[PDB]
Design a protein around this ligand. Sequence first.
Ligand SMILES: [Ca+2]
Lengths: 52, 51
Amino acid sequence: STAVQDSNGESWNTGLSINKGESAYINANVRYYNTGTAPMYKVTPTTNLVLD
Amino acid sequence: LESNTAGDPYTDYEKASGSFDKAIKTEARDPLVAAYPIVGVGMEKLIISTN
Ligand SMILES: [Ca+2]
C-alpha cells in the first residue's frame, strides 16, 4: 500500500504579558504658584502622591 | 572655662543672649540646656507591590 498526505496549516497567536510590579508609568501635569512677598529662584518642590 | 558650656555648637553668650537661630525653643537659652534636636520617625503605612 502506497499512501501520500500533504497537510498545510496556518496559525495565529495574540499574546499579552504584564509586570504586576511596574504595571504603568505615571506622568503629571503641574503648575507652580507663589503667593508671598519674595521671588524664589531655582524652584524645587517635593511632591507627596497619595492614592487612597 | 569653656567656649560652649552646654557642649552644643552655640556658646554661652549666644544661648544667653538669644542671638542665634530664633526657632530654637526658649529654654535652650540656658547655657546648661542643650540646644539639641531629637528626631525619631513614625510609621503610618506599608505598601506591598508584588513583582
Ligand atoms: Ca563659658
